[PDB]
Amino acid sequence: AGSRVTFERVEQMSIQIKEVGDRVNYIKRSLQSLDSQIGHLQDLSALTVDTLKT
Amino acid sequence: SRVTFERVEQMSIQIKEVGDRVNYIKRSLQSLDSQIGHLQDLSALTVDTLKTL
Amino acid sequence: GSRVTFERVEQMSIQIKEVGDRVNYIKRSLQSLDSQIGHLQDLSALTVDTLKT
Amino acid sequence: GAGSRVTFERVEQMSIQIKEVGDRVNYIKRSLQSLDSQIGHLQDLSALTVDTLKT
Numbered sequence: 001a002g003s004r005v006t007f008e009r010v011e012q013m014s015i016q017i018k019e020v021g022d023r024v025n026y027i028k029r030s031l032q033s034l035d036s037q038i039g040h041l042q043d044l045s046a047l048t049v050d051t052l053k054t
Numbered sequence: 055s056r057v058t059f060e061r062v063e064q065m066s067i068q069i070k071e072v073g074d075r076v077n078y079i080k081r082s083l084q085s086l087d088s089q090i091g092h093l094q095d096l097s098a099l100t101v102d103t104l105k106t107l
Numbered sequence: 108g109s110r111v112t113f114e115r116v117e118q119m120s121i122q123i124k125e126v127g128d129r130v131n132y133i134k135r136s137l138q139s140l141d142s143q144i145g146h147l148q149d150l151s152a153l154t155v156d157t158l159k160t
Numbered sequence: 161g162a163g164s165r166v167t168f169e170r171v172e173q174m175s176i177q178i179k180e181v182g183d184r185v186n187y188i189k190r191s192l193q194s195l196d197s198q199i200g201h202l203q204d205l206s207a208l209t210v211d212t213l214k215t
Contacts, residue, residue, distance in 0.1 A: 002106065002107045003107070013097060014210050020093065030078065037075070038072060049172065062154050063155050066154075073148060076141050077141055080137040084134065087131060097123055098120060122205065140185070147181065154167065154170040
């Protein structure tokens with residue numbers, strides 16, 4: 001009863017904890033994509049600076 | 055100069071793509087925060103019943 | 108058994124809270140990043156406009 | 161001449177600010193790995209609690 005509802009709750013926490021994990025992994029992937037775009041922008045910046053010195 | 059204009063205009067586009075992505079990420083975290091709050095509540099309610107047992 | 112379960116759930120609720128806190132820190136960092144990218148976009152926009160003329 | 165001068169300054173500032181944006185995102189990446197580590201410990205505690213009530 002109390003133990004039944006406790007088992008339902010622990011199962012439901014387990015579901016929501018896996019969903020929190022999955023959401024963080026998605027966010028990590030998005031940040032990785034972002035990091036790559038930033039790489040490209042830094043190269044382009046260094047190139048523009050270099051040419052202003054030439 | 056013309057080449058400088060071109061590279062600067064390209065950077066400005068790329069800065070915009072990075073800005074937009076940062077905000078999409080910011081919004082995911084906002085939404086995750088809300089879901090954590092409800093998980094926090096479910097854990098508190100589970101513990102309260104366990105104390106009576 | 109209720110007592111050991113109570114103990115594992117309590118420890119979960121403390122860790123859930125720590126996760127929640129770290130999420131909100133990361134969120135604040137995105138907001139400041141967002142604002143610094145806004146400054147940079149403004150700069151790139153000014154630079155680009157002068158270089159047209 | 162003059163137009164170019166200011167432009168050189170502006171471009172020099174953009175590349176400082178682009179570096180900062182980089183550094184910030186590197187920090188966020190590291191903060192997200194910590195967070196993900198914490199979530200793994202909670203998934204583990206949650207799985208053990210579950211394993212222990214199945215039967």
